[PDB]
Design a binder for this molecule. Structure first.
Ligand SMILES: CN[C@@H]1[C@H](O[C@H]2[C@H](O[C@H]3[C@H](O)[C@@H](O)[C@H](NC(=N)N)[C@@H](O)[C@@H]3NC(=N)N)O[C@@H](C)[C@]2(O)C=O)O[C@@H](CO)[C@H](O)[C@H]1O
Ligand SMILES: [K+]
Ligand SMILES: [Mg+2]
Ligand SMILES: [Mg+2]
Ligand SMILES: [Mg+2]
Ligand SMILES: [Mg+2]
Ligand SMILES: [Mg+2]
Ligand SMILES: [Mg+2]
Ligand SMILES: [Mg+2]
Ligand SMILES: [Mg+2]
Ligand SMILES: [Mg+2]
Ligand SMILES: [Mg+2]
Ligand SMILES: [Mg+2]
Ligand SMILES: [Mg+2]
Ligand SMILES: [Mg+2]
Ligand SMILES: [Mg+2]
Ligand SMILES: [Mg+2]
Ligand SMILES: [Mg+2]
Lengths: 74, 117, 208, 60, 137, 86
RNA sequence: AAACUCCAGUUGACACAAAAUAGACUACGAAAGUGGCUUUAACAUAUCUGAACACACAAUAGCUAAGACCCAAACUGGGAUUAGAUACCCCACUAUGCUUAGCCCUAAACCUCAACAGUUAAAUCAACAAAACUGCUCGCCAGAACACUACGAGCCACAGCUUAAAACUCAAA
């Protein structure tokens, strides 16, 4: 949360997207229902923080591998 | 200093007989128990014993035991307010230890991990 | 209920509003302004702003009423007050020079004091301890003992021991007996006081 | 009164029976002299870490 | 000086006096708080019986003796027989964890006696005799 | 018996405040363990039952000490949210 | 309620019984087991493994004999509860528990997880419990029940222990 503001601004500055909020189950593995059938998922996910707030791996790390999305992580 | 746990439970490396036989695994939980209810202390009992002792001598007349009755009456009024003040104030008022509901919101932010991830 | 929670009960006190602004405290002043915004319930018929209004005599009339016949209960109440009044005037003309100074002729002062001499101080309340109910002596609240005083007076008169005596003559005789700390209603308070002093060993079961 | 002395092992049982018959001896005990028991040097208290791997790392 | 909770040892001389009497001279109130009764016996420093009272001697029977009201009544009755013999200050020696353990001490105060000390002499063995078997009630 | 009287388990009363002396005395007997010992000695506790109780009391202590040690370690984080809004 | 009433309380004298706290320690010993004090003797083995029966041990209960006796206490007796109560609750008392000398040889004798040596990598592992394996050896086990039985043999054991089947039966346990 400390860096949530900074990351969101950079994404807008570089014409890219961000998700620093609570990850609702299904963003990636169920995008068709949530967004629509013709939705286009990310081609690259950059993890600035791979852990969540209870010191466990972010769910998107595992969900991005299921959707064959390459991940970059610190 | 928390007591040791080396060579206490029955295991394969431990050659000696077990010292402890816990029925529940010794693993901290992610919550604490809810505070129990207190039995409470009866009030105005000393004023209530000298007022019922005067009736016996005065054959249960309320004209000679007036002073005793006031003690038993005024006390009841004071005790009544204290019970009302204590109930609301303790929960709303923050003194010393926290309440289970507020302490379990803090233990769920730093849960105990007995597994690997 | 046809009133909403917003509706507030009315204040019939006539000397409250007249109070000068100079006396109004900061907290009270605020209250007065606040009430303006609030919705007020319509005053019920029973209570007016009269100078003869007595809330204790109105509650005693309602506790005698049967089937909503308030004209008869009030009639009985006023007859009783007149009966207490005429009996004391008869005891005042026939009294000695020094006995007339200690004879109360105001029936209200007699009604309020008679009921206060019957109010019990402690009662028996069943408390559950060890899966059993124990009648432990408990300090009755102010209202409870005020209610019992009225209930006992009305039950005693209703009790069918007086073969052919009208309520005003019965109630006036009981009100004058409790005024002098005599009679069955007073005795009924002692019997409850003798049972709360026999069961004093169980005066710790209660917590409050 | 303390009496430090040297004696054979068989003299203790014979001397404990002599002190029981003397009328001026309230109580008398014979113990191994504490100065014939060297005290091993200590380096200090060794901290003990909480026990680990007592339960399997499984999600119960 | 200050106030210590430890009893004044007899040998060493002190200045603590009660009605001109040393701690040793004060009479003793032996309270036996049992589970179904409470016996009280007041004695002098020279082991001379001054007063005896118990719940049974005060007209209580069976389960009324194992209450705090009966123990207090026996304390008032023992504080009235010893107050006629010149007893004001006492040393309490309570024995037992019964209901009338503290209630008898209050009854002694409601009889005109002033308590200067509270001694506990509850029999505790360093294993000796075997108690009765546990019960299923 | 053979020891001096009025030394052991004796508490003196200050300014006629007997209640405080009895509360003080009862706190000395509970901290030393006499109170519970006197209650467990009323009925014979069989070795097997006493060994089952000592283990339960030792495992509860261990758990309660660690549970308390974590509550005092995480009480620093009971302050207001510094990133309110994120 | 019964029981006792040479009863209870204080003080003092006074054990062939049992060993608060320490012990939040985690030790000794083959196990069983062992937690008051002192003293004496004293705790196998310079490869491992190795027995229902050889050899020596083995909680409690129990037998035989002679002693002791505070308390506890199967049986029994009394009191109460209950539809009944050969039970649970109360009281009392005995065998027994102690010692000595012999016997008996059992246990949920279960840390239900053999001894020795070794590893933490790989396929981690049905589940649960106390993570998963390797090497070597002894012992044991092959549906349930009949069966901690019957017979035989052996044993200071004579209502006993050890070893230990089958037939009828089921399609599950
Ligand atoms: C899958 N079959 C289950 C099984 O059925 C069995 C059941 O078999 C029963 C035998 O006849 C009887 O003699 C037998 N009785 C005996 N005294 N030995 C039963 O124990 C047996 N039941 C059982 N093992 N669970 O009854 C038989 C007629 C059955 O249907 C044969 O297939 O057991 C039944 C319960 O008994 C279940 O209801 C069935 O679902
Ligand atoms: K076991
Ligand atoms: Mg279990
Ligand atoms: Mg000991
Ligand atoms: Mg070998
Ligand atoms: Mg073989
Ligand atoms: Mg065998
Ligand atoms: Mg044996
Ligand atoms: Mg034997
Ligand atoms: Mg006995
Ligand atoms: Mg019977
Ligand atoms: Mg015997
Ligand atoms: Mg064992
Ligand atoms: Mg082997
Ligand atoms: Mg088979
Ligand atoms: Mg068998
Ligand atoms: Mg056999
Ligand atoms: Mg045979």
């Amino acid at each position: 949360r400390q860096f949530s503001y900074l990351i969101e601004n950079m994404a807008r500055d570089c014409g890219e997207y961000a998700h620093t909020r609570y990850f609702r189950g299904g963003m990636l593995t169920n995008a068709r229902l949530l967004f629509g059938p013709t939705v286009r998922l990310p081609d690259l996910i950059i993890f600035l923080h791979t852990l969540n707030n209870i010191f466990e791996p972010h769910v998107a790390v595992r969900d991005a591998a299921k959707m064959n999305i390459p991940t970059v992580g610190i | 200093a928390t007591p040791s746990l080396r060579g206490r439970l029955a295991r394969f490396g431990n050659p000696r007989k077990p010292v402890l036989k816990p029925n529940k695994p010794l693993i901290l939980a992610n919550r604490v128990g809810e505070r129990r209810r207190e039995k409470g202390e009866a009030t105005c009992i000393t004023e209530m014993s000298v007022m019922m002792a005067c009736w016996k001598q005065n054959e249960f007349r309320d004209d000679a035991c007036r002073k005793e009755i006031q003690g038993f009456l005024d006390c009841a009024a004071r005790a009544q307010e204290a019970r009302k003040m204590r109930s609301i104030q303790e929960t709303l008022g923050e003194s010393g230890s926290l309440l289970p509901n507020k302490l379990n919101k803090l233990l769920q932010r730093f849960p105990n991990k007995p597994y690997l991830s | 209920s046809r009133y909403s929670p917003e509706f507030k009960d009315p204040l019939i006190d006539k000397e409250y509003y007249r109070k000068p602004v100079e006396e109004l405290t900061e907290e009270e002043k605020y209250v007065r302004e606040l009430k303006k915004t609030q919705l007020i319930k319509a005053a019920p018929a029973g209570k007016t702003s009269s100078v003869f209004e007595d809330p204790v005599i109105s509650k005693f009339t309602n506790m005698m009423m049967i089937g909503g016949n308030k004209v008869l209960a009030r009639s009985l109440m006023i007859q009783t007050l007149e009966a207490v009044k005429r009996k004391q005037f008869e005891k005042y003309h026939a009294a000695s020079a020094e006995e007339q100074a200690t004879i109360e002729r105001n029936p209200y002062t007699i009604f309020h004091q008679a009921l206060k001499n019957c109010e019990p101080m402690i009662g028996l309340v069943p408390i559950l301890k060890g899966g059993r109910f124990y009648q432990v002596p408990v300090p009755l609240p102010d209202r409870r003992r005020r209610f019992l005083a009225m209930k006992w007076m009305i039950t005693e008169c209703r009790d069918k021991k007086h073969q052919r005596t009208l309520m005003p003559e019965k109630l006036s005789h009981k009100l004058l007996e409790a005024f002098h700390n005599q009679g069955p209603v007073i005795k009924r308070k002692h019997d409850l006081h003798k049972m709360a002093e026999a069961n004093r060993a169980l005066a710790h079961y209660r917590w409050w | 009164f303390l009496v430090d002395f040297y004696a054979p092992t068989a003299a203790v049982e014979s001397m404990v029976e002599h002190l029981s018959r003397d009328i001026d001896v309230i109580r008398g005990n014979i113990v191994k002299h504490p100065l014939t028991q060297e005290l091993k040097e200590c380096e200090g208290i060794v901290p003990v870490p909480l026990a680990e791997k007592l339960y399997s790392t499984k999600k119960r | 000086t200050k106030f210590s909770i430890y009893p004044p040892i007899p040998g060493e001389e002190s200045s603590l006096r009660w009605a001109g009497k040393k701690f040793e001279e004060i009479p003793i109130a032996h309270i036996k708080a049992s589970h179904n009764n409470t016996q009280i016996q007041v004695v002098s420093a020279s082991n001379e019986p001054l007063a005896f009272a118990s719940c049974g001697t005060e007209g209580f029977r069976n389960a009324k003796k194992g209450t705090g009201i009966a123990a207090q009544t026996a304390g008032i009755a023992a504080a009235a027989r010893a107050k006629q013999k010149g007893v004001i200050h006492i040393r309490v020696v309570v024995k037992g964890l019964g209901p009338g353990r503290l209630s008898a001490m209050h009854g002694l105060i409601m009889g005109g006696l002033e308590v200067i000390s509270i001694t506990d002499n509850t029999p505790i063995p360093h294993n000796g005799c075997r108690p009765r078997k546990a019960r299923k009630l | 018996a053979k020891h001096l009287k009025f030394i052991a388990r004796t508490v003196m009363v200050q300014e006629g405040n007997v209640e405080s002396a009895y509360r003080t005395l009862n706190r000395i007997l509970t901290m030393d363990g006499l109170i519970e010992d006197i209650k467990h000695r009323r009925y014979y506790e069989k070795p097997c039952r006493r060994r089952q109780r000592e283990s339960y009391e030792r495992c509860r202590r261990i758990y309660n000490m660690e549970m308390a040690r974590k509550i005092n370690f995480l009480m620093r984080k009971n302050r207001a949210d510094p990133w309110q809004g994120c």
